[PDB]
Amino acid sequence: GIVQQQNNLLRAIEAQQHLLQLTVWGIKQLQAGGWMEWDREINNYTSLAHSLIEESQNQQ
Amino acid sequence: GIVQQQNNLLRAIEAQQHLLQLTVWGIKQLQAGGWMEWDREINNYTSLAHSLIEESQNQQ
Amino acid sequence: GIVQQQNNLLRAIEAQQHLLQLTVWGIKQLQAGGWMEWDREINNYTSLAHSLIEESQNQQ
């Protein structure tokens, strides 16, 4: 029921986290100074998302 | 239980929304005409996602 | 209740999947050899996410 649904949703979020990591990687490749804040934010939100994912995986 | 799980999932989606905003911003920086439709779609889906997030936050 | 919440979460994920597709498209436009693995991973995780979304839509 709802449990199977939540597992489905978490897996979708996990797959999208991989896509996000890939697009971030691609953008870094294209920018080749000035991107320091961008890097900082990307790192922080990526770590935040990761922690939430791991917490959900353990919870489920 | 499932309630705590849904809160976890929403937070993960919120963190990923920030990452999406950042990658969009990065791409716009790199493209410097022809991106009018891309801009339109990005704006529409970003607003759509935002509205869904806000609705979920209020609901939870 | 939780059911309406899960529907909200799925829709948010669906909107974010569109944004991901758009940023991927934008990056491909900017890279114009060497991106073969990137392309492979993007395709695989995009298909994975799609399958999870479709499964959730049918389930909900």
Swiss-Prot record, chains A, B, C:
> Which residues, renumbered to this chain, are glycosylated?
N44
Membrane topology, as annotated, equals: Single-pass type I membrane protein
Q: Where in the cell is it found?
A: Virion membrane; Host cell membrane; Host endosome membrane
Q: Which residues form a coiled coil?
A: 40-60
Q: Give a short account of what the protein does.
A: Acts as a class I viral fusion protein. Under the current model, the protein has at least 3 conformational states: pre-fusion native state, pre-hairpin intermediate state, and post-fusion hairpin state. During fusion of viral and target intracellular membranes, the coiled coil regions (heptad repeats) assume a trimer-of-hairpins structure, positioning the fusion peptide in close proximity to the C-terminal region of the ectodomain. The formation of this structure appears to drive apposition and subsequent fusion of viral and target cell membranes.
Q: How does it assemble?
A: The mature envelope protein (Env) consists of a homotrimer of non-covalently associated gp120-gp41 heterodimers. The resulting complex protrudes from the virus surface as a spike. There seems to be as few as 10 spikes on the average virion.
What name is this protein filed under?
Transmembrane protein gp41
Which residues of the parent chain are present?
547 to 653 of 856
